[PDB]
Design a binder for this molecule. Structure first.
Ligand SMILES: CCCCCCCC
Ligand SMILES: CCCCCCCC
Ligand SMILES: CCCCCCCC
Ligand SMILES: CCCCCCCC
Length: 204
């Protein structure tokens, strides 16, 4: 599947575009590659996991998200648990440890590693043949002496996605995210970060 997404961030006063290609294999392997651009008025991420079928409803996915930026490489081993409660309702939970392969100045001025503990919760609800609603909730916290742009050692994200199944292989969507007070505009941080996004996913 190919996903193209454009987004506006209200606190950062910035536009971002994501181009993403993802595929599940019948042997259980799954992978994704994406690029994200950032235009104030950049990253590449590779994700791989393996789907362990516990039964017809339950799947465990050991995986890793590798994140490439100009600062360097960040490795995010994870485990995701997925439950298809019904054909129309799926729940998911993931814990990921984001470990930076590069050292950065911490809040005390010492060189350390800005590693992160990250949890995501997922609910996907196929409302009817036309629409699917998905919510992803996220909590991450710092392992070491660093902070987020909200002046805390932790922050949240909440992503709300409405997908319209126009075609069986074309799915336009709209999305609203609240990314905590993590907006940064001209060195000034602690801004409310609303995120408004529109995209479309294309199946083969
Ligand atoms: C899923 C990998 C677990 C890594 C946790 C490390 C905590 C210091
Ligand atoms: C068994 C996983 C529960 C997922 C919680 C959903 C939070 C949006
Ligand atoms: C179609 C009306 C029910 C949809 C609400 C469920 C959560 C988005
Ligand atoms: C079912 C949608 C949940 C919305 C949560 C909003 C949290 C402030």
């Amino acid at each position: 599947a190919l996903d193209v997404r454009g987004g506006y961030r209200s606190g950062s006063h910035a536009y971002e575009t994501r181009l993403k290609v993802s595929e599940g294999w019948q042997n259980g392997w799954w992978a994704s590659m994406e690029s994200n651009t950032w235009n104030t008025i950049n990253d590449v991420q590779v994700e791989v996991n393996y789907a362990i079928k516990l039964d017809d409803q339950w799947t465990v996915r050991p995986g890793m998200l590798t994140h490439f930026s100009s600062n360097g490489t960040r490795y995010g081993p994870y485990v995701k648990l997925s439950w298809d409660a019904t054909k129309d309702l799926n729940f998911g939970i993931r814990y990921r440890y984001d470990w930076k392969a590069y050292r950065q100045q911490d809040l005390s001025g010492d060189m350390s590693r800005d590693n992160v503990h990250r949890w995501d919760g997922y609910v996907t609800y196929h409302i009817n043949s036309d629409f699917t609603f998905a919510w992803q909730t996220t909590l991450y916290s710092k392992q070491n002496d660093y902070r987020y742009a909200n002046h805390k050692k932790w922050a949240t994200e909440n992503a709300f996605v409405l997908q319209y199944h126009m075609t069986p292989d074309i799915t336009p969507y709209i999305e609203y995210d609240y990314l905590d007070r993590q907006g940064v505009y001209n060195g000034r941080d602690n801004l409310s970060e609303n995120s408004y996004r529109i995209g479309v996913s294309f199946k083969l």
